[PDB]
# Entry
Amino acid sequence: NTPLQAIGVPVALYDALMARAIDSADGTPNSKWLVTASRDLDDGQAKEVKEGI
Amino acid sequence: NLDTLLPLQTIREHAKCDDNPRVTDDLLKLYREAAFEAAELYTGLSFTPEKTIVEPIRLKGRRGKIILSATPIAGRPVVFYGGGLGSPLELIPRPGSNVLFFSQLMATYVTGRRCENSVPAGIIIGILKLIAWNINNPGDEVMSVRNTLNANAQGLIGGTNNGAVISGAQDEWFRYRRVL
Amino acid sequence: NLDTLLPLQTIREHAKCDDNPRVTDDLLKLYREAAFEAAELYTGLSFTPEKTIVEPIRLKGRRGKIILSATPIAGRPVVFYGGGLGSPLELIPRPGSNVLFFSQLMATYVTGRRCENSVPAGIIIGILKLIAWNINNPGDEVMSVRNTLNANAQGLIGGTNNGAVISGAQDEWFRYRRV
Amino acid sequence: NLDTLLPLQTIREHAKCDDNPRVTDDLLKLYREAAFEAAELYTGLSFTPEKTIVEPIRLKGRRGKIILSATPIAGRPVVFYGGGLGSPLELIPRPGSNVLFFSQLMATYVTGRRCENSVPAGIIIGILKLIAWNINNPGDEVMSVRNTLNANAQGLIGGTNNGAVISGAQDEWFRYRRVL
Amino acid sequence: NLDTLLPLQTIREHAKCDDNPRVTDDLLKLYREAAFEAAELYTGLSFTPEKTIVEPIRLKGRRGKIILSATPIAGRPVVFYGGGLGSPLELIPRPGSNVLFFSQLMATYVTGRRCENSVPAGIIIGILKLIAWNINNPGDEVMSVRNTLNANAQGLIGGTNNGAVISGAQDEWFRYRRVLL
Amino acid sequence: MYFFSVDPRNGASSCCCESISARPGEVNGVMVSYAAWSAPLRGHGLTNKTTFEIDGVSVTPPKVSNAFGRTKVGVVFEGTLSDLFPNPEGEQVEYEISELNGPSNGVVELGANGAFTYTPGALFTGVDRFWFSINGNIGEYVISVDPTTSELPQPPFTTPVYVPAARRSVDPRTHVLKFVLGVSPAAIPGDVYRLTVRQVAIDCDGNEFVHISCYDISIGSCG
# Structure
């Protein structure tokens, strides 16, 4: 007759949630500003637009 | 010289102007010069054996980042001097990328494509198209081709009336230009 | 090597152009070469011979992810030297991809493909279609559907005389791509 | 071997190429040799009659569901051996399905239909159609149906110009295709 | 075996091709047999006479529920055996429906229509419409209403009219299919 | 390594026997998966009662004969290699000892004219063979060295294709049969041999369930 009898479900749930958090911490790109040009920009200055931003 | 790369007979055969000329030959030479100087600076790939470059660089990207104007060569070492270096540093670049990782700081190298049989087939095909487009478009017809939907507020006819865009050219030699 | 993959006879009989000298053999060779350089570039099946490469590696992550410019040849050790090592290490890549798992660090793999055959019917169909486009569709007269013309007051319809996508191939190769 | 499955005269009589031979027989059998690599590469199914298969299964779905890579016939019980198991088990499947219940755990059974197996005529009408569409679409004629409604984004002519979908094939091979 | 319940003469009389030598008997047989299962799979009805079935059963829901797979029969007891039963139990289904109530639980019954005078005209009309579409409309050009060939300047409309079930075939068979609930 | 799946005898699924290519000199391993046949017969699986038989369907009889000798321990043995090639036509005899199939516990010095010296390795007593090649035709010469005492018996002149005596096994947990298939260096390209295997299952009570299959060993050159 021990408390560990009735805490399996929540401790497993906690482990799963914390594993999800750890994983998503490293793996979701931390970048913003997804910029996009069009197929008419002479890459040779699209380098220049990037260096500008 | 281009006649080694692309002879006028292949032009006159592709644009279906073998039988009917539709242009004299010197005009065709000028069109070909334009078409080889358009794809060249559109994709960023040179055609002459080299051009030894000397360039002043500025360090940015606290990790330490060097952006070059040309695209190294492919396999040589690039050397940095001045800047405060006791001796010329020597790095080896990544093939096809002008990104390096380290009282002014210069850098010298050579830009590549020293052969002739390396323009694989693509840039040739697109150039044929762009020539073909210029052969019959002296700039008399309007021929403006639509880009994004919303008709401009000013109420004009639209945009992108551009040889080597509204012809095949871009979609043809784009399979080479990188996306980043 | 291509001359055994596509014989010019099969082209001349598909594109129904064998009686008109305007499409010579040098120009049709150019077309048949520009249709194989974009077949192994949209699908990535490496129809180019060998092209050994020596590039510098910049080990990226803490999981130790090595990325490569061009894929290796699936079974030949990619050797790493320099960057502090005093005894070059050899790794075996995974067939198909260009990812590895571990005074700068360098790598010297090999690329391309050696053997003649193993080119599936799916690819050739796409290639025949692409050439059949270019032999009678140059860069003038931006057409419209059912190969018609137009006078659409606003603009025009755009991206119509670009090959490989208006005709077949782009979609007749997708069956050889993935996630 | 193919022409035993699909005689050339049937191809020709379907696609109207008779008393009017378009592309010669050689191109016809090439078309056939490519139209069996879209079909049965799009379906997943193979070419063999009433096979019996052996395969390792897994038990994802903790409750215990098994997903087979075939369709066991109605009545014949599939057997599970290997792995933790005293002796081969006897499970009778659910008719027309591949979901089951309860050191590598393996399973074997008999697929297909008990009787003769041609190539389920019905995944052949697409192959005939895919051939037909390829006889009069050599690749210079711009035909393109729309998938989306809105637009391309820019002045692009919509797009689905694929074949085997514009021909009525994808939606006649789909009846033998699992939707998960 | 499709020779007695769809005479090729009736097809040749429906699609009016009795003088076409470009539709041989083998080709018409391939059409007639690829359309007697491309629109039988679609309705999930066997065409042979009353045909016994045996299959496992899994109860669903706390109040008990037995989903079958045939809509068995009108008025004949389906019986359950195995699975902890001490004696085969007989249930009576309700016409049209295939749901019942109260070492795997098995069930057996008999589906199908009594006589050999097989599938009603509804099924046959669909096949006739599907065959006719198949013989004089191969998939090579996109069509439009009536059967015109348009342009649209933009994408064609031919999402389906290439070779799909545009004819009232597919929908005729549906009159017989069964919306779930 | 070859892997074959057996037909499961269900009334269900160009020649009869599935095919095996072999190269002269290789020794491979063969795996047969009886799972499809013996899994339904819920019992105690396979047993170690397989039986093998080799038969030729096209043989191309050998040209050069093989031969046998004997020697005591430590003493050098001599012999000829010229009476083993009865030639129909007139030709020269380029005797050759392939290093790939030389002796295993000794050395051989091929003389100038069908002569050879086998110096047995010191402190060794067993059987030792080597394979000569008289004008492209290969045969085997087997020598047995005695421990100086009485005499050794005569080994059986290994056949073109064989399955070693005892290297077979069965995994009753996975119903898989393993055996070895070794091909002599004298096997002639183009020939075809037929191997039939008889494997017995067993029920939970110990009765017998027999199964017979065949395989056609096609002796090819260059794999």
Remarks:
- The CA atoms of residues 49 and 118 of chain D lie 7 Å apart.
- Strands of chain D lie at 52-56, 66-67, 78-81, 89-91, 99-100, 106-110.
- The longest helix of chain D spans residues 25-35.
